[PDB]
Every structure is written in C-alpha cells, then in structure tokens.
Design a protein around this ligand. Structure first.
Ligand SMILES: Cc1cc2nc3c(=O)[nH]c(=O)nc-3n(C[C@H](O)[C@H](O)[C@H](O)COP(=O)(O)OP(=O)(O)OC[C@H]3O[C@@H](n4cnc5c(N)ncnc54)[C@H](O)[C@@H]3O)c2cc1C
Ligand SMILES: Cc1cc2nc3c(=O)[nH]c(=O)nc-3n(C[C@H](O)[C@H](O)[C@H](O)COP(=O)(O)OP(=O)(O)OC[C@H]3O[C@@H](n4cnc5c(N)ncnc54)[C@H](O)[C@@H]3O)c2cc1C
Ligand SMILES: NC(=[NH2+])NCCC[C@H](N)C(=O)O
Ligand SMILES: NC(=[NH2+])NCCC[C@H](N)C(=O)O
Lengths: 604, 604
C-alpha cells in the first residue's frame, strides 16, 4: 500500500489474513495436482508460444478449456528459449553437426523450483551448469540428480520433487578462469587471495585496494539486507518474523526504488568512481548503473549466489519443445497479433468477449474470437498492437515506458577444447597438426594492441567463464563436452545494455572477426588453429519477436506502474517474464503463466 | 576544479586570467582568418570524414600540413549528416526523383554561429526551418537571409557575418499541428490556451491541470537558472557577472550532474508521476528520464527556444559535400581503422609518431603513418579499435562507459501535400482522383483501434510537427515544398532511446506499414490515397559507422571523465560531437574540430 503490495508481489505472498505462499500454490498446480477444480469450460486465446504461453496453454488444455495459442514465429516455439542445434533438413549451425549452443536461456538456478520441477516432470535430463570453473576430477555426477527442494517462509513447510540423492556431489570449484582488465591478466583464485594488483589497475587506493569487488558489493548491501533479515554470527542470514520481514522488504521498495545502482554505490555506499568502475567491470554492472537499483539488487540479495545451476541435455530448447508436443492442435504458427479487440462491461454482449486479428508471417488477415485472453508477448512487442477499448491508463504507460534491455551473444566453434589444454597439451596438439607449429606461435607472440607479446598462459579451465574489458566482456566455456565429439562451442561474447549496444551495431557475419581477436587477447593468438570458421550470433534487441533481452526497470518504474502491469484488463490477462519481478529468468514467466492459468480457469 | 573546469568547457571560456571566449576564437579561425600563424608543417592523420574530420581537414590542408582523412564509408562522406536524395546512377529513394529528406541532421539553430557561418562561407543557401507550424501568408522570406549574429559574454563584443536584413521576416506561428494523447486529439494553439483537457488525459489533478507541460518544465528549471542568471521583471534573464556566472554554472554541475532528469522532476521539482508522464510524452522526455539531467537541461536552459532554425537548400548533405570538394587528394574512402599505434615519450623515436592500420570496406591491410592524429569517430566506434600504448585510464573508461543513444527515422513519400489541405481541398482532391471518393472515406470513418471513428479533421498545417503517444511519437512536415513538385516526404516516425528501441527491432521494409497506420491514427485513414508506396528509414543504432545517434551521458558521467574525453593522448587528438558538451548537434563537432585543428597546428 503501495509498497506492501509490491513486497507481496515480490515475495509471492498471498493476500491477508491467510498470507498464502503462492510458490507452493504454483508448485501444486504446475507439478502435483493441476487446476483444481476445473472451472467452467471456456474459449481461451493465448498470444505467444514462449514458456509462458506454453505453460498456460498446457495447463488450460488439460483442464478442459478450448485453447488456441497464436505464435508469430513461423518455424520455432519457445521464444527467448533458443538453441543453435542441427535441425533435420537445415544445414547444421556449426561444422560439427552434433555441436549446439544457447542463443538465450542457459542456466537454471536451484532456487527456481517451478522451472526445475517442470523439467523433471517432462522427463528431461539436467546436468550441472558450471557457473564457476570446476575440477573435473572431483564430485560425482554419475549418481542420480538430486530432487528439486524448496523452503517456504510459511512456518516450516517445504516442497520436494523426489527422494534425496546423497551420493551426488558437485565438483570442487577451481576459479582458474581469467580476469583481464587494464592490460593485466590474473586468475579468479589469485584475485580472491590478493585483489590488490587488479584493483590498482582501476586506480583504486587505500582500503578498497585490499578488497575484492565481490566483497565490496556485499558489504554495501548489508544495511539494505538488515531491513528484512538479521545477520547471524555464522555469516548466514535469517529472515525476520513475517510481520517485520514483509514490512522490511516494503521499506526497501520505499527507500531504494528511486535509486539507480550507480547512485546507490556512489551516494549511499560512498564508493569512489574508481571503485564503481572496478565493480561494474568485473561484476557486470557498468551498463546497469543507470538502471534501477532494485533490478540489480534482486538477483544478488543472496550472499551465496554460489548455488547450484542446471542445464538441459540436448539444449534449453528441450523444455518448450516437449511442452509443444502436448499442444499440437492448439498451437498456430506464423500468426502475429496486430489488433486486440475486447469487450469490457466495467465483439459485444451476447457474443465473443475477445477478438484478435492476426497477419501471416512475414489469407490477408484472420480474426480469432474467444471468451478470455492471455497475452504473453513482451511489452516491447505489444507496443505496436492496436487495442480497443484502451487498457487502463497506468498499464498503457507501462507498455510505453518499460525499458527493455539489449543483449547479444557471439558463439565460435572450435575443433578442439583448447580451454582445457595444459601447456603440454598445447605442445602435443599443435605439433600433431604440423611439426614445429608450437614453437612457431611461441616466437610469434601476442599482439600488443588490445581493444580495451609473451604467449598467453594455458587457460586449463573446465566450465565457468572469464571476464575482460574488451568488447567481448564475458566469455563462457561449455560445462559438458558433447559425447562422441572432440570440439566445443565457446560463448565468445555476451554483454548487456551499452556493452551489448556495441555489438548490435554490426551485422551477424561482421561479428565473428572481432570476437575471435578479442578472444585471443585473453587466451592467446594460437587458439585460431582450432577455430572451425563457423559462428552463430543472436542480437535480441534486433529479434522481431522479442524486441529486446528482457524487461529491466529504470529507477522508480516499479513503484510507478508495476502493480498495474499484472492487473487484468477485463477479459485480457497478462503473463510473461515482464509481469513478474524475476525479470530475465524463465522462472518469472512460469510464475505468471501458472498465476494467469489459475485466474482464467476459475473466472465467472 | 573539477566543477569550474567543467563549466569552462561548457561555456567555451579560455583559461584564466584572460578568460578568452573560445567561440570568438573558433569564429576567427573557421571563417575570418584561419590558422594564424601557420605552424610547422606536419603529417596529420584524420580518422572519419564527418563534419568534424572535414572541418579539421580543410583547415589543416589550407594551413600547409599534409593531411590524409581516412573514411570507413565507401561511397558517402558526412557521417551523421545523411540526406536521402537521388544520386546520378542509383535509382531515386522516392517515387518523385526531385524529393529528398533527412536521415540525420535537419535543423540548425541561430545560437550555433559556427555552423551557420560555415554554411554561408561555402556559398550555400539556407531557408527557415519551421520547428513550429507557421502561417504561409505572413513574413517575408524573399528578402536576403539575415546574417549570423553572436553575442559574447566577454564585455560587449559581438560577431556578425554580414550586413543586416531588415526586410526579412519570419512567418507567424500557427500552432495548428496536433497533440494526440490518450485517445484525444487537440491542436497546439488550443492546448496552450486550455491544457486542462489533455492534462486530465494523463490523470492529472488540481493545479497541474491548468498548466501546460511546457510551463511546468520552465518553472521547475527557474531555481537552477538562478545559479548563473538573474530573472528580470521583463521575464527575460541576464547573466550574473563573470565571477558569479562561472561559479554559478559550476554549482549546477556540482548539485545536479548526479541527478537524472526523472529524479529531478520527481524529487527536486516534486512533480507527480502523472505530471512526468504528461511532460515526457508531449515534450519528449519519457526515454530521457533515466539519462543525465544535465544532458536534457543543456538544450533547454533557454526560456525561449522559440528561436530561429535553418536548413540548407538541396539537403543537409550540401555542407559536408561542399567541404569534401576542397579535400579530393586528402580523403581516402573505404578504409576502416582497426588498429591505432602511437608513440608517447611521456612506431618509435626518429620515426613516425602515429601508425594507423586500416581494412578495406567491407590490399588486406594498409598502414598509415604520421606525426599527429585526429580521431573524430564516435566512441561507440573506437570501442572496437586496438590501441598501443593504452590511452590514459580515465579516457579508456570514457570510451567504454559512454552511453550512446538510439534513434530511428521513418520517411513516407506522398504524391500530394495533404497536411496543407483544408476540408474543401480534401473534397476536391479526392473527387478529382475518383468521383465519390471523398464521401467514400467519410462513411468509412476511422479505426477505433490505436497503438497507444469520425473522420479526423483536416490538419491544414505548414511545417512544424505533431506529437502522439503511438510508436511514431513525433511527425514532422516539410517546411518548404520542392519547386516543380506537387508532393512531399513526411517524417512519419522520429524517436530516441526506448521509443526508438521499438522501431529498431524491425527491419527497414517492416517499418513502413506500421508508420503509415500510426500516421493515420492522427491525420486520418484517407491519407493513404496519396501515399506513393516509397519509404526510407535510418536506424542509427544499427549504422556500422555511427553505432548510435549521439553520445548521451547518464548521471554523473560528465563529472567522472568528460575532462578526460577532451584531453589529447600524446600525438593523438580527439574531435567530434561527443567531445563537446553540445551533444547531438553539428555545432559541437565543429567546435571540437576547430579546437583540435588549432592545437595540432601549433604543436611543437
Ligand atoms: C540472452 C538471454 C539469456 C537468458 N538466460 C537466461 C538464463 O540463463 N536463465 C533463465 O532462467 N532465463 C534466461 N533468460 C530469460 C528467458 O529466456 C525468458 O525470460 C523466458 O523465455 C520467458 O519468456 P516469456 O515466455 O515471458 O516470453 P518469450 O519467451 O519472449 O515469448 C514471447 C513469444 O511471443 C511471440 N510473439 C511476439 N510478438 C508477437 C505478436 N505480435 N503476435 C504473436 N506472437 C508474438 C514470440 O514469437 C515468442 O515466441 C535469458 C534471456 C535472454 C534474452
Ligand atoms: C537522427 C539524428 C538527427 C540529428 N539532427 C541534428 C540536427 O537537427 N541538428 C544538429 O546540429 N545536429 C543534428 N544531429 C547531430 C549531427 O548530425 C552530428 O552530431 C554531426 O554529424 C557531428 O558528427 P561527428 O563529425 O562528430 O561524427 P560523425 O558525423 O558520426 O562522423 C564519423 C565518421 O567516421 C567514420 N568512421 C566511423 N568509424 C570509423 C572507423 N573505425 N574507421 C574509419 N572511419 C570511421 C564514419 O564513416 C563517419 O563518416 C543529428 C544526429 C542524428 C543521429
Ligand atoms: N540485464 C540482465 N540483468 N539480464 C539478465 C541476466 C541474468 C540472466 N537471466 C542469466 O541467467 O544469465
Ligand atoms: N537524444 C537526443 N536528445 N538527441 C538530440 C535531439 C536534438 C537534435 N539535435 C535535433 O536537432 O533534433
């Protein structure tokens, strides 16, 4: 009110006095029971065949309703879940036809139970996603995968997917990947023990030099966490009682939504400009500084985002495609919504309540009618749709003003996994190709020029990723090799906002040359030997169906109209990543999709 | 120090104790005298053939130096000065081969003397640019064009281009153009007299309803203007004495650069969210809210930006192309800088001080050597250049962190100038095409659906532009008809940042359909009759040579590193729009170009 209702939307708390944990509700519907009870059968139109439209479409189809899912894309479902894999007719995206890589979603955390449990329910195998590079000679991933476990704020209630897996063990993290800033290059393990050398590269002085950018961030967020939490002597934090925990989060909204992350680190935490430059570079907050503090704080209110990540065997595309198998009659491809007409008594009486006119991608027009509608397309895409009658004023402003972040990924295929090589592996692998080739690159050295002469050391890393200040910014290595293959696809460039704005000023074929050179600036020129020449890129700002990476609020935007983002417009409901407060996560879309399916199922 | 030196950069004040007016210096060099005296002849490399590289190239060539201007574009000079006109071989961009429109710069203010005087010196005719629609039956534009006049802060010194023109008179403004927000549509003259109806459309209440968004902005900026200025009883403002005027501006930097424009209007001016929504919609500040207050405040510290604008006969391209005629031997086309190597004693001693390696657009490589260098390419473009040795740390961060705004223009050609039509003109012009066609569109009406049924009224406007909340946002009409023609090219869509981010998620041929429909939402469906089918668009975020519209700082960025943006890096100097504080203006580039030519001409 308004802050308390925002905190309820954030923490998934039902209305008073019950204060129901909506996460438990969503798990009961999505996994355990379904839509109980099945409401009056309705004709339901669903716009968009991403994970939100598919989750809601599956749930409502199995509940008895007559569902039609209109999808603008002509060949592919899943939306922002896109995997570069070899389709049957098409040529393969890479040289090795078995190689694949992600254009969108790639890692799924353990604290997102809906998405993980949905993956298991559909019978998909999931492996560990190595967010930090690991020791491949540790842990036990041959054991059955541990079940999905969620702990609720409500009393001591929990939710579990299956029997525990005591022999499954995560491999030990190495932190042997690189951090190359200001023409100097160390390893994450060395930066943790002595951050002084790198921090001085950002012209830091005094106490901030002997602190890692990670610790600096967490120390600054401690007084904010004190609103809803209590720091223990363990270093662990426990949440305050529900009354003071809900009011504590509501005070974070009141006192910090008007802050950007940059203004927070500069004025509230009193960090130097040099400290922010170092933090934003190594921790990926440069191009998020001018965006809302709350957006950045939400992913990282955890003080151990050292948790478990997962990825699907065969690609993230397995999740939406498996759902699409149970929706063959419902999914209509190649139909883009251009006109949304609905009837709000608060297309007329006695007739259909919702009329959607589509245009073939890319009959002249088709009109789809129904009783209720679920629009799961991004607001950057809804912006070009004509509507009658007008939505509520505050939602219209939400569709107009919602900032949509930019994101571009550049993928380079390699015939060998050179990032796992030791220096001895380099000597053998290069000479095997041609005698004397190893010594040849030793004498050649490294280019002094860098977009930010001794041969770079061997990376020798399994999974994880390296950070740099050249346009590539972040470079992820595959967590698991494709069996029967010898190569792998490196995520050579991955950035957001202004950093991504650099890449999406060029075309796709113009991206591979720069990304390889900037990859050599960190790992060495000699990696060019194993480059197959095949590359893939995905600019989400320039995708006609996504029109951006994800909804990312600027300061105060959430307080202004987010409570109006979720509110239905008569017979028109809204789901998707932008409707939740878990922006740019699959879980946020699955949350609002299940939430929308519940509301439309029991509608009068 | 640091604020005072920023205020000196802003106001073009030379160093103490002389406190020279640099604008007078730049006028003396660019127009009157030149580089006096001609310094030691040098080999100078200039990167980029936009207005900054051309102004500096012309000045240094005529001063005796050996200049080579490397331009990445293979066919066109001028950079962000781009005009859609019919070239000799090419097919014409529109149906009428005589029609032209601007892809970039289009209006030149009277308070930008360098650009206006440069246009006159090159012998180019300039007409009035009607920023607000005018009465074509008023004023006298047949008289000779008035000379360029500039008033300096220094004492009572002025600068004039030529003899005055007392008979030249600007046409009276009509404000008959449209403002269509929240499904309601009035005219700018009616909104000025009674803003109550439109403001209530943004859900405003109380005193703010009876105030135009324009007046609300100026009232909020009055205490800021009180820093450097004094409000008179005339309503006019005079500047304080130089001591308190320079320190006043330096206090604006100190107290407001950490503000965004949204945070300023919300926290300092205490406007409601509804007030900001109304202001940002009608006055074009929605997608600039999260950007620096200082960036937005700089264009509008004037309380009468009701001043005189100008445009060049034949297109804005006349200005760079005319300069390019005097640089035929110096300009090298189709060569993109990929590696910048220089020698800074503070490519070695005894040899060339600057070595630039280029790649043909789009010999494998070419190396260009010289004694000094002037890089006029945007920082979004320099970001992908490899450099040795590294620039100063703060400049490197400036190249990395500088936000570059997005901008897209959509141009639609029409066989007639329907925006000048009266209702009687509509009746005759439609029936002339086909009998009964006028009545046909009267019965057809207007689509109720809108991306935000009685036939829209006749616009009947000459010049100026209309404002709306649909994706087109701003629509400008040609100020002057092309003689011998009957049609004209409407700027159907023109937006920045998030508003422009919507359009540059589609391709060029995908833009014309939406822009015409949204144009009909304001002017009427019946305008489709005169649409020739030919369109032109320009997405500057997706231009490989611009990589964005212009440098636009986020909060605090200017205080952080702008003094390091201008600072030379040994033998490498920097010019361009981003180097000045007049971002997204031609004048800012001409300022830094002349400023760079002066420094490199007298270099030891
Ligand atoms: C680069 C990137 C990386 C990501 N990584 C992760 C990650 O590691 N983990 C994670 O959990 N999440 C990640 N995400 C987020 C996740 O991919 C999405 O949030 C998720 O797909 C939810 O999307 P959605 O269902 O809300 O909408 P979308 O997936 O975008 O679905 C929208 C659908 O609507 C269709 N559509 C659009 N316009 C129209 C129209 N006019 N008419 C009809 N149909 C239309 C589109 O074709 C599309 O299929 C990432 C996102 C990006 C961009
Ligand atoms: C949509 C829009 C509207 C505008 N309207 C106005 C207006 O009404 N009034 C006004 O005064 N200003 C306006 N401007 C601004 C004005 O057009 C520019 O500020 C002006 O052109 C100054 O540009 P510049 O010389 O600094 O650089 P640019 O004009 O951008 O020149 C850069 C040049 O460098 C070249 N180049 C780029 N990368 C490389 C490389 N790697 N190697 C070699 N060469 C390279 C490019 O090809 C280009 O020719 C507008 C700008 C835009 C985008
Ligand atoms: N602009 C953003 N913060 N986007 C989201 C980044 C995190 C993303 N969901 C991931 O798994 O990597
Ligand atoms: N993002 C911006 N404010 N860009 C500049 C807008 C003004 C522009 N120079 C013009 O003449 O119209």
């Amino acid at each position: 009110m308004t802050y308390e209702q925002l905190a309820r939307e954030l923490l998934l708390v039902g209305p008073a006095p019950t204060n129901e944990d909506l996460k438990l509700r969503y798990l009961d519907v999505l996994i355990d029971n379904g839509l109980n009870p099945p409401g009056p059968p309705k004709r339901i139109l669903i716009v968009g065949a991403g994970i939100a439209g598919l989750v809601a479409g599956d749930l409502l189809t199995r509940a008895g309703h007559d569902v039609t899912i209109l999808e603008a894309n002509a060949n592919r479902v899943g939306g922002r879940i896109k995997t570069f894999h070899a389709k049957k007719g098409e040529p393969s995206p890479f040289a090795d036809p078995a190689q694949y890589a992600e254009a969108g979603a790639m890692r799924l955390p353990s604290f997102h139970p809906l998405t993980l449990a949905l993956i298991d329910k559909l019978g998909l195998k999931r492996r560990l996603f190595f967010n930090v590079d690991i020791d491949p000679q540790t842990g036990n991933q041959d054991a059955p995968v541990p079940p999905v476990f969620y702990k609720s704020f409500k009393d001591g209630k929990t939710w579990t997917n299956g029997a525990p897996s005591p022999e499954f063990k995560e491999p030990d993290k190495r932190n042997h990947t690189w951090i190359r800033t200001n023409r100097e290059q160390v390893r994450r393990a060395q930066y943790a023990t002595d951050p002084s050398s790198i921090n001085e590269g950002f012209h830091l002085t005094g106490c901030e030099t002997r602190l890692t950018v990670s610790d600096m961030v967490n120390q600054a967020l401690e007084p904010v966490r004190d609103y809803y939490s209590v720091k223990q002597d363990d270093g662990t934090r426990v949440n305050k009682p529900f009354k003071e925990w809900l009011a504590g989060w509501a005070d974070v909204v009141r006192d910090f939504d008007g802050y950007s992350m940059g203004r927070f680190l500069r004025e509230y935490a009193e960090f130097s400009d040099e400290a922010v430059e170092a933090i934003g570079t190594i921790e990926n907050m440069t191009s998020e500084l001018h965006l809302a503090f709350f957006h950045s704080f939400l992913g990282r209110s955890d003080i151990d985002p050292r948790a478990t990540y997962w990825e699907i065997e065969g690609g993230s595309r397995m999740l939406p495609e498996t759902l699409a198998k149970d929706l063959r009659d419902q999914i209509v491809m190649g139909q883009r919504m251009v006109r949304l007409e609905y009837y709000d008594p608060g297309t007329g009486p006695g007739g259909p309540a919702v009329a959607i006119q589509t245009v073939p991608e890319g009959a002249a027009t088709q009109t789809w009618t129904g009783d209720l509608a679920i629009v799961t397309i991004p607001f950057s895409s809804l912006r070009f749709v004509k509507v009658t009658p007008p939505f509520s004023y505050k939602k219209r402003r939400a569709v107009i003003e919602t900032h949509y972040d930019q994101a571009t990924k550049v993928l380079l295929e390699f015939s060998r996994r050179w990032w796992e090589f030791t220096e001895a592996d380099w000597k053998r692998e290069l000479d095997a190709i041609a005698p004397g080739l190893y010594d040849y690159y030793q004498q050649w050295g490294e280019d002094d020029a860098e977009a930010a002469g001794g041969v770079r050391p061997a990376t020798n890393a399994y999974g994880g990723g390296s950070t740099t200040d050249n346009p590539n910014r972040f470079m992820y290595y595959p967590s698991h090799p494709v069996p029967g293959t010898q190569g792998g696809v490196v995520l050579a460039a991955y950035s957001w906002s202004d950093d991504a704005a650099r890449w999406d000023s060029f075309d796709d074929a113009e991206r591979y040359g720069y990304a390889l050179e900037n990859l050599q600036s960190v790992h060495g020129r000699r990696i060019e030997v194993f480059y197959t020449g095949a590359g893939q890129t995905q600019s989400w700002l320039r995708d006609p169906y996504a029109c951006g990476e994800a909804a990312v609020y600027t300061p105060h935007q959430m307080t202004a109209f987010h409570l109006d983002v979720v509110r239905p417009e008569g017979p028109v409901y809204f789901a998707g990543e932008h409707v939740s407060l878990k922006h740019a996560w699959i879980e946020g879309a699955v949350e609002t999709a299940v939430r929308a399916a519940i509301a439309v199922n029991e509608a009068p």
